[PDB]
Each structure stands twice: as structure tokens, then as C-alpha cells.
Write a protein that binds this ligand. Structure first.
Ligand SMILES: O=[N+]([O-])c1ccc(O)c(O)c1
Ligand SMILES: O=[N+]([O-])c1ccc(O)c(O)c1
Ligand SMILES: O=[N+]([O-])c1ccc(O)c(O)c1
Ligand SMILES: O=[N+]([O-])c1ccc(O)c(O)c1
Ligand SMILES: [Fe+3]
Ligand SMILES: [Fe+3]
Ligand SMILES: [Fe+3]
Ligand SMILES: [Fe+3]
Lengths: 202, 238, 238, 202, 238, 202, 238, 202
């Protein structure tokens, strides 16, 4: 057997390789980005946004974020999905973005995912898997984003129910807002300190 | 074959989040322990990228940003295999790389080092592994980068890399170094890794039989990701 | 002989309170250092329990909870000596033990592991050491217990134990393992102990000459508590 | 010379061995408990109660607590007590309890101890020695409980006076309350964080 | 490829028939040496069993005899590969296993040990290897068995196994043990094997990456059978 | 190259795994047994029976026996048979049995095999390959059973002729008897001592 | 303390019955293995001899047969302790010894060696061990004895001894040698013992601090017998 | 722990130390012998005699034999006997003899022992424990002598019933004879070969 290659921080210049347009490098014709909605994509459009804060309460202005999620019917656009259902054909399910160098704000344009089966016949509440990379972070940090308008499904979610300190569950619930008829979910991440966001070893 | 979950990440084989010798980790590491969860479809699936979207020079850092001539520096090819921990090849995984130029200067708005910029070098590339898990790219060997951790900190020459493969649980970013670089023994970032054998796992080896005469040297570097177990009895994933 | 205080606890011979590899210690460890005090009567005295209150099967985990038959599992006797650090026997100390059954399942409302429950096994016992510090109990060898620290954490087979002896300063809870168990090298709880020789102090040894033919195997396990110094000059305890 | 056997956490199922009735195991005729008052025990009866909190301010619902104390005249029911006084004959001086699995509350029924001699002719203020064991705790944590109505004796207590950070002394003083003519002392323990309880290496 | 005979059995790699430390072999071993013969069709052929006749739980000793609940004991998966001495996979071979329960008690009319019987455990299973020579079964780890050779003889925990493969010459019965069992060094049956490296060939290894969280541990055990030589000149088999 | 896995005795409880019905374990729907004759099997039916004796002349009451043989035309029901002839389709060619726990008697119901080619153009006399496993036996013992009514073929058999001590050849010849019109061949095996049965390393 | 059975004799620590290098064992060794039995009162009891019957010179081989003068030869005292395998002293056990004289000549009708007979030496003695298990006797150091195994066989100087102690199971006869004798490495009787450390257990050591000036040298030799286990649960002996 | 001192043969001159009178050495006033009957000894007197034969069927003329047995009521004259019964006070229970140098005959004068309790409430048949020492014998050989007139008790004896080869049990039964009103039990021991006497590891 082999050991997994060890992780190392992405460092402050991770944009060069993963978001070259943010580093002002035009080298690729097709660039991976933060827009998961194609013209024919099914589902309700939403915007996910927030900032990531360090232990002094300051935003990280060099953080890189990725999300992975199911389509509107809770099917993943992956050959490893075993539901035997047809996935939305105009949906990659993944996106990547970087916080703005001046403000630290990040965002994604995506759709609200449908509920995905959990283990042993259970049903998970709608959620987005998110990972954070940045200078100072030795191993990408995994977390999940749940939605405050899915109270009923959240209360029965197997992963949230597996966090024994109940007060910490709330850090994984994003808040719905409506900005000009656009649905926005605000999810701020706090790496350390009070109200520290739950991080998972997955 | 019915696949079950990925094997658990061995935390002793990776750096801890809090590592005081690497100063910026002090305020950017959680104080709480990570919460381990049992895997679901969310953790064992991942996106698929198609080679169709990739340009012909995406894995050629020598030519993909070249405008008036060739970049200055040591011509090198890097290749190897991406496998999972059970030794199976990882097919069609997305590998993205980024690095500094031959001066140890990064093409990034926030890099102010005096090492010179090279107008013909960008420093980023990408490729998909083939069906044997093999990948290959060509580049200029980067110079070591001085930075402020302690004031006179110098990192060894390195190439950063990221992989997106079959399962979200496999998501990984790291960097590799070049055999023999004396700075490897002093780097505080490499030293966050606890064990000597894992630090050695990040060193690319000189592959002399693959050098191209009067052209380029070659380095061999293999990458190992987490692997899934097969299930033969109950399948609780779903 | 006029007894003075117990010798200081050697903190290097025990786990630290904060041990990140054992995740639940992160929020349950003091951030302040312990305040060391000079001992008084409070620290050198302790209660006395009388053997009269103990039932005949209290040290027989094979029979003390048996209802319709015998518990399923490996019949084993465990015995040894409790001594203080100066080698003196610890007489009439209360030893209490608890463990999982042969499936690695605990008889506890909060244990939900699928390993099967054994209706004829309880998993707790107690005894007083005799005048030579000797103790002996019989039980079923417990199976290893999977638990959630990292998701696939497994503890080696073990028996938990507690001692209340002559001085409150001697109060101790720990657990012992069985010689040869391969899981000993991976347990994050055992690894909170800093030194290799102390980790070895928790391993009970196979005692082949004390096996009972066609009946039970036997393990030897000695326990060492803090010891008091004798005083020959001033006695400041009081 | 020998080294002391190393400590290990009691783990979440410590009730099986030390409080089987709490784990629903009826195996012993005589069970050690939290009631130190026998019919003929001398002294004023008191109830000691509280909760133990972790670093997030949440109560530990699997903690096990023991207390050790002198009788009403400050004599320990131990052969190691050298005062040459007769101890109350109907007093064990020790008790054990577990926090309630749902609320985390723990309590003991005991009597207020008399003052015990300190080192070199000193006199200690009345106190109870307490130890805490639980999952997450690698070595039992020792502390003492003093009483807020013994202000005068507390001010002269040698151990309290040996804590150089004076503001921390207050964490060892329990608060007297009267519930229906019953005297109750509330002692909450805070393992980590603000107002962290002083722990001793004894 | 035209196959010739199986390679000769290396008698030094197996126990001798007469082995006085294992007392029952004294009257059950031939006094004459074995007569070696050159192989014919009789020795290189063997029967074929079809998977169609096998039930769904035949390789699941945890469930195949379960009536009112699960058997008591340590849940373990055992898997590995059956290969011939030239390293080729042995395909579709019949593997049959039998063992004692978690008490070291066998479900057999002649076993009278006091270790308790488990009404939900039988102790036998079977499977066919696949095209890669791979096999897998699940069971309860057996307890060590006391028996009368010398009066206090104890065998280490073990699982007996039998293979019927491609040639009658390959017919084999043996047993494997579990890594770390201290009784391995004292067993008079294992000691009939002359060499240390062959005794080690019967030890199944802990396979930590294949453990199933909060469920079962896993052991790896490979088996090697005799192999046939290829013929390129005369074929005297017939 | 690899070394063959070493043999170990089957032990006294080998019935559990190989003849569970004899150990009173009903776990399989289909159980391997000692009856090689199916309804449409071709050939003359015979019964093979005997006992196995130890060095004191006592029968082994825990021995397990298997036989392997060709069909009536001397073709093995194995892919390794290279004769290019069609084998009887209703014949497994193998069977397994255990001696009776009280008497030590064992038996098989099978058919008399046809002659099989020997090496280099030779022809072997009809025979059955037999193996014995039991407590006390470290490696399964191989032997062959020839038939006393095939005197002519036995005299020319290559394997029998390769036993240089001619007096020992007779221990491999079973004796034909007729019990009620049933043809029976009695083959007693003597593991040690006078008239010890020839065992082969094959 | 309720005593259970003696621990099983470790057959690997003793010579086998059949040992071809010691020719007379070929016809005087059983062909069947020994039948091990569980012990009863018969095996754990033994006779008691009273010191009252012993003469004053029974442990003095220098004087007990002396008629007209002292025997010729090296004056030596032999002493030591008899203990059981758990280290407990064996009290009041009967020790009987016999040996050749200083010429290596035995006072026995069947000894015809030409080494000279000593009219003042008999060669036998006996004693009871005291409460500490201690014994002491004085004698003449015997000379090596030539005998016919191979024609030129010579045994090292030795003293034969027999013990009858607390249990019939402890019954033992053996012999000890003297430190440094070069013949120890060649003796076919000593070589029937399989292991080197057990052969060393029969060598008496020079005890220089116990020599008696201008009188006698002294050798130290301890003997270990089987020991009984204590019983704490069922007592099946009866 | 310690290892038992290894056994070594007694050799041909064992008489010097254990039966000096047979070696013609008069050195002790009191000599241990083969007469276990004292004037007031209780029980029926018997003589036990026989020879010991080697593998060629020849008697050993240098063998030394000892016996150990209970008194007439089955009580051992040993402090280790736990029956709580009074033993015959004029009975040592042990004796030693040597075979005659010319004929190999040995004998003892003793009494027939009473039945002794076996393990777990069982009752053993009357028996004498015997041990043999001699040149050629590396470790003293243990055996038992049972009596042919105790057929009923022998059939239920736990040790005899534990010999799985039943035909060997008969080698432990001595034959009763009456010589001039004296009761004699003849017990010949065969060390090797046909009818080899059962030897025990006790
Ligand atoms: O601090 N920085 O800017 C750094 C330090 C090390 C690096 O490898 C890097 O790419 C950037
Ligand atoms: O987490 N638990 O439940 C555990 C873990 C290890 C133990 O030894 C135990 O008794 C309980
Ligand atoms: O003597 N027996 O009964 C035994 C001894 C060892 C075994 O492994 C066994 O299955 C049976
Ligand atoms: O053969 N003998 O006569 C011998 C051989 C060795 C001896 O130690 C002995 O006492 C007698
Ligand atoms: Fe870099
Ligand atoms: Fe535990
Ligand atoms: Fe077995
Ligand atoms: Fe001698």
C-alpha cells in the first residue's frame, strides 16, 4: 500500500494556477469560474456570497473557494453517482472563485440543490460542499452550506445531527435574503475564535 | 465491483493545521478539532472535465505564454503517475500547476520580489491524466523564492499542483521539489509535514534516461491520492 | 516511621491534558497550567472500604451477571500486584474494572455499536488487594472497540481500571491492554502517553505457567502508584 | 525505583465500572453512591450541586465526580489522619456521582466539614477535595470547594493564598443558598476559557 | 501453451509425517517413505464446482447460521489471493473454511470444552475464487482452543481452510493465524513446520486500510499452491 | 518464485467445514457428499468401502476421505483432461465422506472407472485416486485403489510397476465381493505397521 | 491459599526419551507418546521423611564411610537452594546423592574400571532441605568416568542426585557437573538435553567466598522443581 | 519464573545412592526399602511383583522402582491430602526396590489401597502410582497399577477412561494370584514393543 501525498498550503499566489484571470494572466481560452448556471440549467437560481475571517476577525483577501453540489433533483453530475437517475445535462456541479483582493468578498452563481440520499436509507437536507484554500492553511478546509429556509429538512439531516455540540450546527446554515428579486444566501466563514465554523474531515 | 467509501485520511501523514513555525497558520487554523463524518454520495462524487476544452499548449509552460521569443531558464520535462493508495491508476484527473519563473519571480499582482519578470513566461498549465494515470508537462525550472516568515526565509525551487479526481474526498493541493536542492532541509512549510518519509514523497527525481539531448532534462514525480474500498457485504453508502 | 508527603507526580510520565490527536481533549483540557501545592492531611488521607460489603462474585465477570448460561468469549484470569513507587505493597486498595464484551460492545445506554450484546455478561467487577498488594479477577477477553475520533478509529482490546488506595494523591484511573494486540501501535488514546516505556507499562503479559488446562488463559499485570517518603527530621505535614 | 502507572481517560462508559446503576447494571448488592450522610452522622447537612462546562460553555453530560472530606470536627475517617482525635464513626468521608445524561447536573448529600490543620501549625479553611473524570480528560482533575460563608477562614487559607493570581481564587468558592430550609452550595466547574476553575497538581 | 507436470512438492517446506511433539501423529504416520511418482492425467486433473449451487450467505459466517440475532464476537473480514508457485492466479478454486466460535468452542459433537456455544454461530463457509484468484469471507474472530496434547496445550486463534483447485496434486488443507497472537510461538502443531519462514506464511496480516468504520476489522491472507511447468519440447504426460 | 503454503493437519473437527451434516450443522442447501452416481450416469455401479487403521490396529473414527476418478470411458470430468474425448456429462468424478464415529466404516457409491492413458503411450489399469485427512496426519496421504478383477491390466500398470518392493503392490488392490447383486470393493487402509498401505508423493 | 495442580512439565526443557546418541535409550524408550492426565490427589501428594531417622554423618561423604583414615581426593562442600518454578522454597525435601570416588571409580558390584577403589570412601549421602530450601553436604570431588557408549566415551566429573519433595509430580533424578570441566561439551548424556540454557542449569559454580582456608573448596548449585498454582475460583482437584 | 531442572538418567549405579544395601554399602542405620507394612498397619496385605522388559523382550536387571499409594481407606499419608480424614498412622505410603541383578525380578510388600476421590466429585478405582528409573531412561517413567479384581471400579475410573485406545487400558491391570494364602499381584512392565505399558506425563 501507498501513503497519500502530503498536503501543503496553496500559498498567496494560488490564483496563478487556479484563477489566472484574477492574476491577470490570459493563457487559456476556456477558464474555470464561479458560474455554475448555463442557459438551459434547471432549478432556482441563487447567489451564494460571504467573506472568510481569520482569528483577528479580519477577512482573508487571498482565499480561494470551490463548491461541489447536486442538481435541482439531488443527482450529482458524476459517474460515481449511483442513483440511476438522469442528471441535468447542462450542469457541471462545481465552480471556483477567489475573494476580491481589496474587500475579501467572494460569490458564486448557482442553483439550489435538491435533497441527496444519505446513508442507510436516510435523506440529507439540501447542501453545498465547500472547500477553502489559502496561504496559512496547510490542508484545504471542508465545510457544508445548508439553507435557513429548509428548517424541517435540516432538523433531520444526518451530518448536522452528528455534530454533538448543537450550538455549532448553526454555523453551517446560510441566511436567505432577497436583493431585487434575486435570491441570495450569505455564508460567512470564521476560521478561528468565537462562532468558529464547523470543518469536516471527509 | 460495488465501491464503498474512501479509506480514512491518515492525519499523521499530513501537516497539522496549527504549525507555529509557519507563522501565517497561527491565525488561519481552527481551534476546534475537525469533525469526522461517515461518507455519503456527496463525498464520493466529483466533477468531470473534458479534454475538448483544453488548448494544445495548456501543458507547455515553455510556449503557452511565449510572445516574442522563448522564456529564459532551464528547459525541463516533468512526468509521472497519479495512483490511489491501493495502487490503481487515477484516470482523467485534472492536474493544475503554477510556479515562479527562472528568477524565483511569480507573475502575480502581489509579488514584489526584485527577481526579474520574464515577458515570455506565465507560469501556469493544466492537463488531464490518461488511462494509465500518466501525466507530462514541460516548463522552465523555477528559482527558489525569498519571502517573509522569518525575514530571511527562502523556499526551495518548487512547482505547486492541484488535483481534482474521482471523489471530492480526494481533493488535494501540494507542491513538489527537485532532487538535491539544499534549501529543502530548511523550509518551514515543508517542515510542517511530521515525518521524514512523507517529506521525501514531495521530491521529484532526476530521470536521466528520459533527458532529450541538446534540449531538456527530465524529472519523475508520482502522486498518490486516497483510494476507495470495495464492498462485498452490506452497502450502506445509500 | 513517620510518613511525610507523597513524592511529586512526574508529569513527563503521563499524558498532557491537551492532546489534539485525541479530539475530545481539545475542549476538555484546562488552558491554565495546574497549580502545584505542598501536601496536607487532605491529600495524604483516603477512605477505607470493607470487604464485608462485597459479594462473592464481585471479582468474577464470568459469573456475576450470568442468568441463563455462561457469557460467550475467551475465558481469562488477570492477576498482579499493586505497589507504590518505592516498591512497597499497597494493601486493601479498592480496584474497580469495566470493559466491553467479546464483541467489543459495552453494556451502556450510549453505546450503539452493532457488535452483539451478550445477555449473560455485564462487564464490571471490583476487589480489594490483599496484604501483599495482590489482586485477581476472572473475565471474558474484550473485543477491540471502533469509535469516532477519526471515522475509522479502533481501540485495542482493553480493560479499564480505577484505584482508591491510601492517599487521595494516589487516585488513579487508566486501562491495560493484552500482549501482542496489533492495534496498540495505532491507538490515539495510548499515544497521548509521551514515552515508549510508559506505553509499555500498560500491557498485560501472557502468563503461560498460570493457565488452567481446558479452562482459562491468564495475564499478569502490575500497577504502580505514587509512594510516600519517610521523615526523619522536621515533620511539617502538620 | 518504579514509575507510576500512566493515567488514561476514563472514557464515556466509566459508569459501567464506577456507577453501574447509572448504566442500568444491577450486579452488586452494595453500590457506592453520592450520599455521605448516615442516620447518626454528625454535623450540618448540606447539598453540593452544579454542572461542569467545556470550552464552548456546554455542560459535560458524561462526567463522573468524587469528593473526599473530613467530618464535622475536621478529622478524616482515614488511618493516615494523625490528629489523634476520634473521627465521627458513621462517616465514610467519600462519595461518587455522575452528571445526569440529559442535563449535566450533579449533586452530593453530605455535611459541612470542620477546619483541618494545614502545614507548620496553620489551619486550613473548611473545604471539600473534588476530582473529575470523563471522556476527553486524560488525567483526573483535582480542585477544592470552599464555602462563601467562611470568608474569614478563606482569607487566611494557606492553599488559596498560594494561588498568585488572586482573581482566580474566587473560582473555588461555592455559593450558599437556602432551598426550602435545605442548605445548598452551588459549585459550577469551568474546564476551560473565561473564569476557568483552578485545578491542582496534588 | 502445452502444460506439463506440476513442480515437485518441496518436502522441506512442509511438516514431516512423524512429529513426536504432536502426539497423535506417532501412530498415524507411515513408517515407510512416500513413493514418488511421475505425474499422469490422474494427478493433473481435478473436479469443477459451479457457483450456481452456492447459497448467498455461504461466505458469510456472521449471518449464515444466524437465527434470533447476531453471533457474539469480533466482526472481521478475511480476504486475499490464491496463486500458484509461479505467481499465476488460481481461478475458480473451491475454498472451504471452519473454525471455533468467539469462546474457542467448536460446533462439533466431540468438542466438550466449557467455552460457551453461540446459538447464532455455525463456524463453516465456502466460496470460489474469482478470475484474479481473489477470495473474501466475513466471520467472527475465533478464540484460542485448549486441547489435550500435553495437558495444558492451547492453540492460537485460527481458521482452518481447504482448497480444491485445478490439479489433484494441488490438494491442500492448512490453517492460518492472526498477526500478533502470542500463542503462535508455543503451538506444537505449528511447530511441526521446519522453517521459520514457512511458519510465518500461515499468519494473516492486519489490513488497516480495509477496516470498515464502526463495523468490521480486516485481515489479508494469501495462499500459494503448486504450479504447473509449460512444455516446449516432448510432452510425455500422455 | 513462491513457496507452497505449508500443510497442517485437518484436526478432529474437519467435519464442520467439509461434511457439516456429519457435525449436525445444516447451513448449506447443497452439500458435497459420497454419492458420485447421478440418475443418468453411465457405467457399472459399485460400492467402495473399508476402514483406516492406526499403528495399534485400531480404526480411525475421525478420518475424512476423498476420491477422484475418471468416467466409465477413462475420461476425467476436468478441463485439464487432454484426450479430446467427450466425458460423461452426468459425472462429477469426485466425492467426500467421513468414517462413522462409532465404527470407523466409510463408503462411496460410484462407478468403476475406465482405463486412462499413462505417460509416453502407456495405458494405466483402472484406478481411483484417494486422499485421507485426519487429526494426527500433517499432510493429506495420497494412495490409489486398483481392482482385483483387473489382474491383467494391473500387471502392466506403470505406477504399480514402479513400486520396487513387489510385495507392497498388493496393498493397493481392493477385493471384489457381491452383496445381494451389488458389487462391493473392500479397501482397508493401514497407515503404519505390517501390511502398511503404499502412500504416494504425487 | 487453596492449591490447585502443578504446572505442566515443559517437555522441551528435558531430554526426549528416545535419544540415539545415548545408545542404551534405543531399547529402553517407549515408542508411544506419554499420555498426559489432569492431576488428582495421587499426583499432588508425596511421602514425608523425618530427620530423626538420619545419622549425623549422612551428609558427610568424607567421613561417613571412613574406617582407617580419610578418603583420598579434593575436599569440597556443595550447597544451594531447592525452589519451585514460582521461586518458593521447597522445605524438608529428601535429597539423595551418589558419585564415584577421586579415581572415577564407583563402589558398585558392576563397575570394573581400573581406577582405584578407596577403602575410606563410600560415595552416598542424603539430607533434608531446611525451611529456606537450603541444603549442604561435603564430599571428595569425583573423577570423570570412562564407559562404553562409543568405546572411548568419558563423562565429566559429576554427582548424581534425586529429590522427593511435596508432590509426586515433582519426583526428579538428575546430576550436576563442576564449572569449567572440558568434558561437559562432549558428553552424550548431557547432550540429550535440547537446549543450551538447560544444559547450563546442571553446572555447579565455584563459590570462592565460601572456601574454607587450608581445608575445602565450595560449589554453589541450585535446583528448581515444578510448582503448584493457587486456585481462586473453582477447585476441581476434588 | 524459573525452568525446572532437567532430568538425566539415573545410570546403572543408581543403587549406590538410593539402595546402598544392594550395592553392598553399609553406611546408614536406617535404610529405605520395599516394605510398606508395619506391625500395626491396617488393611489387606498383598505382594506386588513383576519384571520390566526392554524392546528385545529382555528384563532390565538394573532398574529401580518406587511406588506411592494411599492407605486402606484411600487417604494419603501427606500434608497435601485435603480429605479431612485421619490417615493410618503406621503407614508411610511409599517404598523403593531394585530388580535382582540376576533375574530382573522386583517386589514390594504393601497393602491394597482404598479408593481415592477423583476430580470434580468422581471416585478413582484403587491404584498404586509407580515410577521406574534406570540406565537408558532419561526421565523417570510414570505408570499406575490397577487390580483385576476391581473390575467394576476400573470400568468407571476417570484416568483409565481417558486413554482413548481402549486396548491399551489392559496393560495397567495387575493379575491377582494366591500363593500359599498370600495374595500376589503380578504386574510386568513392557517399555517398548507389543503390549507396551501405558506411561503418563503427570
Ligand atoms: O509568501 N509568499 O509569497 C510565498 C511563499 C512561498 C511560496 O512558495 C509562494 O508561492 C509564495
Ligand atoms: O468513544 N467511545 O465511546 C470509547 C472509545 C474508547 C473506549 O475505550 C471506550 O470505552 C469508549
Ligand atoms: O484436539 N483438538 O480437538 C483440536 C486441537 C486443535 C485444533 O485446532 C482443533 O480444531 C481441535
Ligand atoms: O555406563 N556406566 O556405567 C555409567 C556411565 C556414566 C555414569 O555417570 C555412570 O554413573 C555410569
Ligand atoms: Fe510557491
Ligand atoms: Fe473502553
Ligand atoms: Fe482448530
Ligand atoms: Fe555417574
Amino acid at each position: 500500500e501507498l501513503k497519500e501525498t502530503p498536503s501543503q498550503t496553496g500559498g498567496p499566489y494560488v490564483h496563478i494556477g487556479l484563477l489566472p484571470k484574477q492574476a491577470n494572466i490570459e493563457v487559456f481560452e476556456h477558464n474555470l469560474d464561479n458560474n455554475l448556471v448555463q442557459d438551459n440549467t434547471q432549478g432556482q437560481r441563487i447567489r451564494l456570497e460571504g467573506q472568510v475571517f481569520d482569528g483577528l476577525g479580519l477577512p482573508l483577501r487571498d482565499v480561494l473557494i470551490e463548491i461541489w453540489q447536486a442538481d435541482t433533483n439531488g443527482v450529482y453530475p458524476s459517474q460515481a453517482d449511483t442513483q440511476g437517475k438522469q442528471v441535468d445535462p447542462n450542469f457541471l456541479g462545481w465552480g471556483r472563485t477567489g475573494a476580491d483582493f481589496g474587500t475579501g468578498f467572494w460569490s458564486f452563481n448557482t442553483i439550489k440543490p435538491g435533497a441527496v440520499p444519505g446513508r442507510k436509507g436516510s435523506t440529507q437536507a439540501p447542501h453545498i460542499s465547500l472547500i477553502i484554500f489559502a496561504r496559512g492553511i496547510n490542508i484545504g478546509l471542508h465545510t457544508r452550506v445548508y439553507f435557513d429556509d429548509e428548517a424541517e429538512a435540516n432538523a433531520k439531516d444526518p451530518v448536522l445531527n452528528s455534530i454533538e455540540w448543537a450550538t455549532r450546527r448553526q454555523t453551517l446554515v446560510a441566511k436567505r435574503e432577497e436583493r431585487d428579486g434575486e435570491v441570495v444566501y450569505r455564508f460567512d466563514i470564521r476560521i478561528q475564535g468565537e462562532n468558529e465554523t464547523v470543518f469536516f474531515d471527509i | 465491483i460495488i465501491w464503498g467509501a474512501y479509506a480514512q485520511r491518515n492525519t499523521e501523514d499530513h501537516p497539522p493545521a496549527y504549525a507555529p513555525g509557519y507563522k501565517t497558520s497561527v491565525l488561519r487554523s481552527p481551534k476546534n478539532a475537525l469533525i469526522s463524518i461517515a461518507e455519503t454520495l456527496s463525498e464520493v462524487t466529483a466533477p468531470h472535465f473534458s479534454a475538448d476544452k483544453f488548448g494544445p499548449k495548456d501543458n507547455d509552460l515553455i510556449l503557452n505564454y511565449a510572445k516574442d521569443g522563448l522564456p529564459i531558464g532551464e528547459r525541463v520535462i516533468v512526468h509521472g503517475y497519479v495512483r490511489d493508495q491501493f495502487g490503481r491508476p487515477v484516470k482523467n484527473a485534472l492536474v493544475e500547476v503554477w510556479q515562479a519563473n527562472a528568477s524565483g519571480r511569480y507573475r502575480h499582482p502581489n509579488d514584489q520580489y526584485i527577481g526579474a519578470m520574464d515577458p515570455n513566461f506565465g507560469g501556469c498549465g493544466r492537463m488531464l491524466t490518461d488511462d494509465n494515470g500518466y501525466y507530462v508537462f514541460r516548463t522552465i525550472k523555477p528559482g527558489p523564492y525569498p519571502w517573509r516568515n522569518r525575514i530571511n526565509e527562502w523556499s526551495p525551487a518548487h512547482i505547486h499542483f492541484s488535483l481534482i479526481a474521482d471523489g471530492w474526498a480526494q481533493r488535494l493541493i501540494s507542491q513538489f521539489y527537485f532532487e538535491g536542492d539544499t534549501l529543502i532541509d530548511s523550509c518551514p512549510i515543508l517542515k510542517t509535514i511530521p515525518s521524514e518519509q512523507q517529506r521525501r514523497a514531495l521530491i521529484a527525481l532526476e530521470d536521466k534516461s528520459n533527458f532529450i539531448e541538446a534540449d531538456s532534462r527530465c524529472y519523475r514525480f508520482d502522486i498518490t491520492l486516497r483510494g476507495r474500498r470495495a464492498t462485498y457485504f452490506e452497502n450502506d453508502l445509500t
